[PDB]
């Protein structure tokens, strides 16, 4: 369904898509091939929907965190740049777009949130979050506010939640442990409570979103905002003289923004892959190409070594990198989707007074991992990992109905692969129930009960945070 001979590109509306079009135009006059740049709303949700059915754009732009989910769903084409090209970019940017050992996208630029302040309202920005209430009290007397930023997206509140100990998934022994979520520890509670207190004490508003915060700062109504490099262009256009600096500390600890790598993935169902690779490697990822995008809306610290050498002289880029080095790279695991939705809900509910901080974060911890992932853990860790290889052979025998080239493929499959195939075939609930029935057929009554009990535990947890 994807038209061959042209390039369709999806990029978020807050990025420099006009500049990217200019790169596309130059790419056209050099090979006669049309390049269309679109910025549909909720593209990071639309893409896994429309690309699963073989459609969608040829190239999708987003921060790297979404791409692992896409890759697990087989939506992305593996990219293979020559080592000569790989040397052109910083190694850590390639690290961000690597999933299960394979490169699943081209890294473009490194983004981190910074504290943006109005130099005319506030010559010396605060070093701590704790100073902010007093600063607000002072500025309110002048008819201004201290700080306004997007409270509707958890990306912006995360640096504060993570400052004193909050985290997404524990990284240990070279992998993210999805059984170890840190959105409900003492550090997370402390961070979110402080934000909620700012609202209760009338220093912020719960309903503040991106557009409200941007307008307020760019009109000189608020002394500070929190935003990324993509926002600098609009501030340049405004009458506000601004500085970009390190985020305030909380409890003596640096704010820890999630570091995003803007990345370009290629649709696995695209007939223009080779064209897409050519566009990215030879037109976009060049000094001239990146400059075109960057002049529309700043990219931050770009992945291209040669161009970044120039951009790094910018004090705003230095501030971006300082904040990034105090932060954490976003995990790209498929569970990141569930994580973000959960924390988004937690922050919104707590800020609005709908839930207490404790109840909101308790719910977020349970919801940070999707049911299918948890059910897969039951099937694999509690079920298959508790039986021998010979017992696994007896198990696979009962999987002959769900024909899956069981002649040789199923006989070769390891435990993870067996679990994946059952869930892919019947859905998570049916896969776990079938595993239980097979264990009961093999007379593993004890093991089957343990699976039932674990399933009951998971279901009860989800139930206790819904109403």
Ligand X SMILES: OC[C@H]1O[C@H](O[C@H]2[C@H](O)[C@@H](O)[C@@H](O[C@H]3[C@H](O)[C@@H](O)[C@@H](O[C@H]4[C@H](O)[C@@H](O)[C@@H](O)O[C@@H]4CO)O[C@@H]3CO)O[C@@H]2CO)[C@H](O)[C@@H](O)[C@@H]1O
Give contact residues for ligand X (rule: CB under 6 A): 12, 14, 42, 44-45, 63, 65-66, 111, 153-155, 228, 260, 337, 340-341, 344
Residues 129-158 that bind K ion (CB under 5 A): 145, 148
Task: Rank residues 39 and 344 by Cβ distance to ligand X and give the closer one.
Answer: 344
Neighbours of 218 (CB within 10 A): 20
Smallest gap from residue 341 Cβ to ligand X (A): 5
Task: Rank residues 156 and 395 by Cβ distance to ligand X and give the closer one.
Answer: 156
Task: Rank residues 59 and 122 by Cβ distance to ligand X and give the closer one.
Answer: 59
Task: Rank residues 373 and 440 by Cβ distance to ligand X and give the closer one.
Answer: 373
Return d(Cα 270, Cα 248) in angstroms, integer.
45
Residue 194 binds which of ligand X, K ion, none (CB < 5-8 A, kind-dependent)? none
- Up-side HSE of residue 403: CA atoms within 13 Å toward CB? 2
Task: Rank residues 90 and 230 by Cβ distance to ligand X and give the closer one.
Answer: 230
Which strand (E) or helix (H) includes residue 344? helix 336-351
Among 16, 24, 56, 68, binds K ion (CB under 5 A): 68
Q: Who contacts 288 (Cβ-Cβ below 8 Å, separation ≥6)?
A: none
Alpha helices by DSSP H, listed for 238-314, are 273-279, 287-296, 305-311
- Up-side HSE of residue 116: CA atoms within 13 Å toward CB? 30
From residue 91, alpha-carbon distances to 86, 97, 122 in Å are: 8, 10, 38
List of E strands, 105-201: 106-111, 114-118, 145-147, 167-172, 175-182
Binding piece for K ion, criterion CB under 5 A, among 65-73, 102-110, 161-169, 259-267: 65-73
Smallest gap from residue 2 Cβ to K ion (A): 23
Residue 69 binds which of K ion, ligand X, none (CB < 5-8 A, kind-dependent)? K ion
From residue 460, alpha-carbon distances to 53, 60, 345, 376, 465 in Å are: 34, 38, 20, 17, 9
* 8 Å CB contact between 212 and 221: no
The two three-digit tokens of residue 361, written as one number: 């974060």
Among 121, 336, 357, 458, binds K ion (CB under 5 A): 336
Task: Rank residues 265 and 300 by Cβ distance to K ion and give the closer one.
Answer: 265
Nearest Cα neighbor of 7 from 191, 280, 349 is 280
Task: Rank residues 126 and 260 by Cβ distance to ligand X and give the closer one.
Answer: 260
Task: Rank residues 98 and 251 by Cβ distance to ligand X and give the closer one.
Answer: 98
Could you say whether residue 126 binds K ion (CB under 5 A)?
no
Smallest gap from residue 223 Cβ to ligand X (A): 22
Smallest gap from residue 373 Cβ to K ion (A): 12
Could you say whether residue 128 binds K ion (CB under 5 A)?
yes
Residue 128 binds which of K ion, ligand X, none (CB < 5-8 A, kind-dependent)? K ion
* 8 Å CB contact between 17 and 39: yes
199-238 mask for K ion (x: CB under 5 A)? -----x----------------------------------
**Owner of token pair 């987003």:** 62
Strands 222-227 and 114-118: antiparallel
Could you say whether residue 191 binds K ion (CB under 5 A)?
no
- Residues making contact with K ion (CB under 5 A): 68-69, 128, 145, 148, 204, 249, 252, 334, 336
């Amino acid at each position: 369904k994807i038209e061959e001979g042209k390039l369709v590109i999806w990029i978020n509306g807050d990025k420099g898509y006009n500049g990217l079009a200019e790169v596309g135009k130059k790419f056209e006059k050099d090979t006669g091939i049309k390049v269309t740049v679109e910025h549909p709303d909720k593209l990071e949700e639309k893409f896994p929907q429309v690309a699963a059915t073989g459609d969608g754009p040829d190239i999708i732009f987003w921060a790297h965190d979404r791409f692992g989910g896409y890759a697990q769903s087989g939506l992305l084409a593996e990219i293979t740049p020559a080592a000569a090209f790989q040397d052109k970019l910083y190694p850590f940017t390639w690290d961000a777009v690597r999933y299960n050992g394979k490169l699943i996208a081209y890294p473009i630029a490194v983004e981190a949130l910074s504290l943006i302040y109005n130099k005319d309202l506030l010559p010396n920005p605060p070093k701590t979050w704790e100073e902010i209430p007093a600063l607000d009290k002072e500025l309110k007397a002048k008819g201004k506010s201290a700080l306004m930023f997007n409270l509707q997206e958890p990306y912006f509140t995360w640096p504060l939640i993570a400052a004193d100990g909050g985290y997404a998934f524990k990284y240990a022994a070279g992998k993210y442990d999805i059984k170890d979520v840190g959105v409900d520890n003492a550090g997370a509670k402390a961070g979110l409570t402080f934000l909620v207190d700012l609202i209760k004490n009338k220093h912020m508003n719960a309903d503040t979103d991106y557009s409200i915060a941007e307008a307020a700062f760019n009109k000189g109504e608020t002394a500070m905002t929190i935003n990324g490099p993509w926002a600098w262009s609009n501030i340049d256009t405004s009458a506000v003289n601004y500085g970009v600096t390190v985020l305030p500390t909380f409890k003596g600890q640096p704010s820890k923004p999630f570091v995003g790598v803007l990345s370009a993935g290629i649709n696995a169902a695209s007939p223009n892959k080779e064209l897409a690779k050519e566009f990215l490697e030879n037109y976009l990822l060049t000094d001239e190409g990146l400059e075109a995008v960057n002049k529309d809306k700043p990219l931050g610290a770009v992945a291209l070594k040669s161009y970044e050498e120039e951009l790094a002289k910018d004090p705003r880029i230095a501030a971006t990198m300082e904040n990034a080095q105090k932060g954490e790279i976003m995990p790209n695991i498929p569970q990141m989707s569930a994580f973000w939705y959960a924390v988004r809900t937690a922050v919104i509910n707590a800020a609005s007074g709908r839930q207490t901080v404790d109840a909101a974060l308790a719910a977020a911890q349970t919801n940070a991992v999707d049911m299918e992932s948890k059910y897969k853990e039951i099937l694999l860790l509690t079920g298959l990992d508790n039986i021998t290889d010979e017992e696994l052979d007896r198990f696979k025998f009962f999987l002959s109905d769900e024909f899956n080239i069981a002649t040789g493929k199923l006989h070769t499959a390891n435990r993870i692969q067996v679990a994946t195939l059952m869930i892919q075939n019947a859905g998570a609930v049916s896969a776990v129930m079938k595993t239980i029935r097979i264990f009961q057929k093999l007379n593993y009554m004890l093991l089957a009960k343990r699976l039932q009990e674990e399933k009951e535990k998971v279901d009860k947890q989800y139930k206790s945070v819904t109403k």
